[PDB]
PDB file of N, CA and C and ligand atoms in Angstrom:
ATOM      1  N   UNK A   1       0.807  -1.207   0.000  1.00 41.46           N
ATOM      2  CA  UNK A   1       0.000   0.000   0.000  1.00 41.46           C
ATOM      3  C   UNK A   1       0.843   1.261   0.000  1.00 41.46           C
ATOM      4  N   UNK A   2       0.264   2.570  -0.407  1.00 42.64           N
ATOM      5  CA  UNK A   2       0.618   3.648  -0.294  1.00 42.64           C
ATOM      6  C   UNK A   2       0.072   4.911   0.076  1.00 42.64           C
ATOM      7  N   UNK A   3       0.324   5.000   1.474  1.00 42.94           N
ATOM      8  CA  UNK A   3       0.054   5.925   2.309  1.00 42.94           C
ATOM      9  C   UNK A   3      -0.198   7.386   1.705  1.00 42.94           C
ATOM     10  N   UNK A   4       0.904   7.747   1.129  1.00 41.68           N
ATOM     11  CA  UNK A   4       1.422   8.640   0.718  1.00 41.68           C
ATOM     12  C   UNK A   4       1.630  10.223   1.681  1.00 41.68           C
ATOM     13  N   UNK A   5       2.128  10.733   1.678  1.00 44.58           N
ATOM     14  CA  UNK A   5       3.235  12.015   2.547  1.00 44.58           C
ATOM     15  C   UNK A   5       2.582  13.392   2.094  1.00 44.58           C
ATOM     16  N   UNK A   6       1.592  13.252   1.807  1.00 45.85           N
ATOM     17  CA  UNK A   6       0.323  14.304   1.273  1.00 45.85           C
ATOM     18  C   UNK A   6      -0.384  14.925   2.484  1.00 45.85           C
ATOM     19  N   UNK A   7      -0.420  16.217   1.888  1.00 45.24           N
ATOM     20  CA  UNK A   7      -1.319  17.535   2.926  1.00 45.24           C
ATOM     21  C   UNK A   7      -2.789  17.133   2.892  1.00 45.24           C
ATOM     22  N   UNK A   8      -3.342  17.709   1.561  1.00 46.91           N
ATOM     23  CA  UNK A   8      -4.945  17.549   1.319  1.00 46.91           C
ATOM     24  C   UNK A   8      -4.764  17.410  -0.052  1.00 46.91           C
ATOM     25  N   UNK A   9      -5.836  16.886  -0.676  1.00 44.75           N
ATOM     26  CA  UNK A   9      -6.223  16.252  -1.995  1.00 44.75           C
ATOM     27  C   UNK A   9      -6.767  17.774  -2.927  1.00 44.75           C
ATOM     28  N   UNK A  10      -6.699  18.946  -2.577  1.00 45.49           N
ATOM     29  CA  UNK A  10      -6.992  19.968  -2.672  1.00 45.49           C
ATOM     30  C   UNK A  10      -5.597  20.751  -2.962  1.00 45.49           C
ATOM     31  N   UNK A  11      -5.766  21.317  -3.918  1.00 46.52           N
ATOM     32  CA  UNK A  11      -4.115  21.998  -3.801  1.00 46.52           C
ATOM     33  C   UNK A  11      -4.412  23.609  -4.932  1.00 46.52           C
ATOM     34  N   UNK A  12      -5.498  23.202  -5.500  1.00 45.15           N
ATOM     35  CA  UNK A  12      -5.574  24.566  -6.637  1.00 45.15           C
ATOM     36  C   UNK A  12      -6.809  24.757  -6.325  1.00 45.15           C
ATOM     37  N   UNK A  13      -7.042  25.619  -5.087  1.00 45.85           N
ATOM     38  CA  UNK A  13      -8.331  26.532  -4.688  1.00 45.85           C
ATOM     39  C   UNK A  13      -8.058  27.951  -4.727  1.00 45.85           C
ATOM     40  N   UNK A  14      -9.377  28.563  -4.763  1.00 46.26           N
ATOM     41  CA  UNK A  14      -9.352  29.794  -4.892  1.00 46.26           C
ATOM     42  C   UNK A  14     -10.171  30.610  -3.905  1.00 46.26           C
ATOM     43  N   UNK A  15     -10.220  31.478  -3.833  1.00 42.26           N
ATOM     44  CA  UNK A  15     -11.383  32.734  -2.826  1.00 42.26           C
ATOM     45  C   UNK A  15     -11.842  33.237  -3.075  1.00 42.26           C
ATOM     46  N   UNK A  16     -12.774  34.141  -2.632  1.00 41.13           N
ATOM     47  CA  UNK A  16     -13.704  35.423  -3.081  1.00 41.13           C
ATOM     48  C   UNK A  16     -12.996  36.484  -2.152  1.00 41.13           C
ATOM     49  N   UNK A  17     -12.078  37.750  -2.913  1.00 43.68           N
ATOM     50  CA  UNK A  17     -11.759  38.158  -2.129  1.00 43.68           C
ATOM     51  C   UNK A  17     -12.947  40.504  -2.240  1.00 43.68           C
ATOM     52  N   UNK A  18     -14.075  39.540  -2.151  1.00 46.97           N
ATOM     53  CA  UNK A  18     -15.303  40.118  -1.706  1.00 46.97           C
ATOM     54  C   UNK A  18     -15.888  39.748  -0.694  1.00 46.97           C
ATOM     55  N   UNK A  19     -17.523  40.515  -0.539  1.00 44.97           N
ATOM     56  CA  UNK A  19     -18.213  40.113  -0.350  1.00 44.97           C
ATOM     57  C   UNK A  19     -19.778  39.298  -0.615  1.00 44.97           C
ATOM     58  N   UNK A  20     -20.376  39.126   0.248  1.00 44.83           N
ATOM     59  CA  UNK A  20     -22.136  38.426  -0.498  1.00 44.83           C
ATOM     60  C   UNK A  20     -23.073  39.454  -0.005  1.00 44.83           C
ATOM     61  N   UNK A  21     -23.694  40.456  -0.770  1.00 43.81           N
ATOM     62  CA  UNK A  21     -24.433  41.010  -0.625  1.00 43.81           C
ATOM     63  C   UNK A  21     -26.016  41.408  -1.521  1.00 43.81           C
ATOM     64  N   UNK A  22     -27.228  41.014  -1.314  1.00 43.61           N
ATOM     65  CA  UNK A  22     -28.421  41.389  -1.843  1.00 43.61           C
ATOM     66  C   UNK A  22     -27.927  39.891  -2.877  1.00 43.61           C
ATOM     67  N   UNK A  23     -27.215  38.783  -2.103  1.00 43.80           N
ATOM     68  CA  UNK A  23     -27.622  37.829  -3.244  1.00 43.80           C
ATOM     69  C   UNK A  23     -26.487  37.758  -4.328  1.00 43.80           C
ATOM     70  N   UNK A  24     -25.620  38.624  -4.320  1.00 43.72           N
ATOM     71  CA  UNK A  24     -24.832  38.739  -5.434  1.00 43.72           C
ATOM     72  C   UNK A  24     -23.256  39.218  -4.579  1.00 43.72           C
ATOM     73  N   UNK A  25     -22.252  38.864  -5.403  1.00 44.08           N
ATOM     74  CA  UNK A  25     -21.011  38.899  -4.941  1.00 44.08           C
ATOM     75  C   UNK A  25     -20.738  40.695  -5.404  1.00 44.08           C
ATOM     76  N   UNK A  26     -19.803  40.996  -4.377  1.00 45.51           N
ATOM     77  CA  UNK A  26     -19.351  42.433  -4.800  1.00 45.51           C
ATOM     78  C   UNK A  26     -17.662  42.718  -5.407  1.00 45.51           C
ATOM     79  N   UNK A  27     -16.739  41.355  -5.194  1.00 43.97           N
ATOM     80  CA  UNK A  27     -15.523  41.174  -6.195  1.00 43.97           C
ATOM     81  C   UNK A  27     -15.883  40.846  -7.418  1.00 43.97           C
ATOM     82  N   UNK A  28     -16.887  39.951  -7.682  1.00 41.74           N
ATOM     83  CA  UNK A  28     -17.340  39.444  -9.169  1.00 41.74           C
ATOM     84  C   UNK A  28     -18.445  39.832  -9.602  1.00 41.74           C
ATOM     85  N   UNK A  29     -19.433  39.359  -8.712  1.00 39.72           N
ATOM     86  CA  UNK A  29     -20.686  39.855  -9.004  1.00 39.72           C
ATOM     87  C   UNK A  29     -21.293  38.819 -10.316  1.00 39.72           C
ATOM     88  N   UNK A  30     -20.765  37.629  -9.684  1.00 38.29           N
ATOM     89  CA  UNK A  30     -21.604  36.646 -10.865  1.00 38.29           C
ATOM     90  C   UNK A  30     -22.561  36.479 -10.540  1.00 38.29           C
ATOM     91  N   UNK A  31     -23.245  34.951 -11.305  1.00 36.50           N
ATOM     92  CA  UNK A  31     -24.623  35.190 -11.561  1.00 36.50           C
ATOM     93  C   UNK A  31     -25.077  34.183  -9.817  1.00 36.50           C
ATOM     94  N   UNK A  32     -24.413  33.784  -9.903  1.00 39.76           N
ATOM     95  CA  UNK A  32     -24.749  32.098  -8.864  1.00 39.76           C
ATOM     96  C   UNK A  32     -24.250  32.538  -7.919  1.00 39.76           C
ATOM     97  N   UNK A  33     -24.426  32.110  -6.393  1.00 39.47           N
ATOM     98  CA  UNK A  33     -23.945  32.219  -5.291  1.00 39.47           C
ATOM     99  C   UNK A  33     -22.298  30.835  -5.272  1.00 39.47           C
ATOM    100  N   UNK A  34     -22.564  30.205  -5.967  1.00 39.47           N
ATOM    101  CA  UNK A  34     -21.563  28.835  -5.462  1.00 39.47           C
ATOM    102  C   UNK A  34     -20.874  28.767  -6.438  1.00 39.47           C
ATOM    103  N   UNK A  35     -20.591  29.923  -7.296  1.00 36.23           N
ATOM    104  CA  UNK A  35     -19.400  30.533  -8.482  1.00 36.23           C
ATOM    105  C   UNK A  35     -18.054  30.071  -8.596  1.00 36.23           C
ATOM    106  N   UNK A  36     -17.395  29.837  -9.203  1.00 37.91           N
ATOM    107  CA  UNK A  36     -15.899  29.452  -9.415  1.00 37.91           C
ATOM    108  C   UNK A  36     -15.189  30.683  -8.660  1.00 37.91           C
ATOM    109  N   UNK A  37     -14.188  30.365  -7.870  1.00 38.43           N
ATOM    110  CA  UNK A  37     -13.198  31.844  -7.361  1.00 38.43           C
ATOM    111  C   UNK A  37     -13.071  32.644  -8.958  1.00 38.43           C
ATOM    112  N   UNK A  38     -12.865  33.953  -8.371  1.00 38.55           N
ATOM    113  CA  UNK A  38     -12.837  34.811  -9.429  1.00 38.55           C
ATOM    114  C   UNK A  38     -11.116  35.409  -9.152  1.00 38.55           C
ATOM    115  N   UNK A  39     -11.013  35.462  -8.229  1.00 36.62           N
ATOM    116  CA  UNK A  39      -9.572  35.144  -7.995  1.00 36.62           C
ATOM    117  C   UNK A  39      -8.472  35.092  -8.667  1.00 36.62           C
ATOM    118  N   UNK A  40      -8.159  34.727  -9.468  1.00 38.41           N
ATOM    119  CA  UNK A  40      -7.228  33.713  -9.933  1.00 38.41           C
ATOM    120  C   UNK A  40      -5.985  34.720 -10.496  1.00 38.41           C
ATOM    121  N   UNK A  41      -4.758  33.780 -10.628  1.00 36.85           N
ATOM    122  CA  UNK A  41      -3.405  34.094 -10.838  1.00 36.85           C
ATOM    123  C   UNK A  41      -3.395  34.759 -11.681  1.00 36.85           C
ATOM    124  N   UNK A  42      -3.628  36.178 -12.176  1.00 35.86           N
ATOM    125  CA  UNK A  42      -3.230  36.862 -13.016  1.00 35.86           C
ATOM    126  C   UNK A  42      -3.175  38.259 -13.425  1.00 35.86           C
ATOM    127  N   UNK A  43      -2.225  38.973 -14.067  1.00 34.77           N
ATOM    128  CA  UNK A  43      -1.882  40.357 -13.986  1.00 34.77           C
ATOM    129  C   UNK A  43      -2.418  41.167 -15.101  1.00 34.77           C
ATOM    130  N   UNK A  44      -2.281  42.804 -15.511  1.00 31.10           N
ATOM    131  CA  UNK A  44      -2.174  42.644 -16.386  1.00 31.10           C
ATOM    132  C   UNK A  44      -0.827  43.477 -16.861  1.00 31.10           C
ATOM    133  N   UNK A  45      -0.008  43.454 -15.845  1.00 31.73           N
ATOM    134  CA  UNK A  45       1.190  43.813 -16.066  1.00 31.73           C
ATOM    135  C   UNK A  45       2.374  42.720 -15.809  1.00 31.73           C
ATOM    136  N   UNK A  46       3.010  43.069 -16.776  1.00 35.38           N
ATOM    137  CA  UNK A  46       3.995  41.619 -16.315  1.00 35.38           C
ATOM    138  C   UNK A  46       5.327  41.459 -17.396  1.00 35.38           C
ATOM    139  N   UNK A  47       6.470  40.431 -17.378  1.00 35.82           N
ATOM    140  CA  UNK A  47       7.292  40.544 -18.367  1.00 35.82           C
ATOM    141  C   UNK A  47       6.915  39.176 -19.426  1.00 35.82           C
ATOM    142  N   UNK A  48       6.123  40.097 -20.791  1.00 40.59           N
ATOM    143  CA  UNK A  48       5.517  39.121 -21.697  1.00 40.59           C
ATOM    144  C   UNK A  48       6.470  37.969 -21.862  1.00 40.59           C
ATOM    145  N   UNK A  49       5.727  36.756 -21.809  1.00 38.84           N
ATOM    146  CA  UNK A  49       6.702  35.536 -22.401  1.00 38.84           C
ATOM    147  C   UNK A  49       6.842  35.216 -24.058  1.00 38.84           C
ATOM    148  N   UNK A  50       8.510  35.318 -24.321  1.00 33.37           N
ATOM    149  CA  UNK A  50       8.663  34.942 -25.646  1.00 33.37           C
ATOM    150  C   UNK A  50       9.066  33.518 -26.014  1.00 33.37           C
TER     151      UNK A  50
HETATM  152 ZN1  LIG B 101     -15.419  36.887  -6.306  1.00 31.71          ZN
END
């Protein structure tokens, strides 16, 4: 068997770094309450990759 030397089975989560208000998010403001993080890794400044 293999135990394995693992944290959590979870490793690429995200947040709402809002709030929930009148039903609707105020960082995204999608449509659903149980939305994908809006979060996510990215800029729009940065050194383009060639
Ligand atoms: Zn959000």
């Amino acid at each position: 068997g293999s135990s394995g030397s693992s944290g959590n089975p979870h490793l690429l989560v995200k947040y709402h770094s809002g709030f929930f208000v009148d039903g609707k998010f105020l960082c995204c403001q999608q449509s659903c309450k149980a939305a994908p993080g809006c979060t996510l890794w990215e800029a729009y400044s940065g050194p383009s990759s060639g």
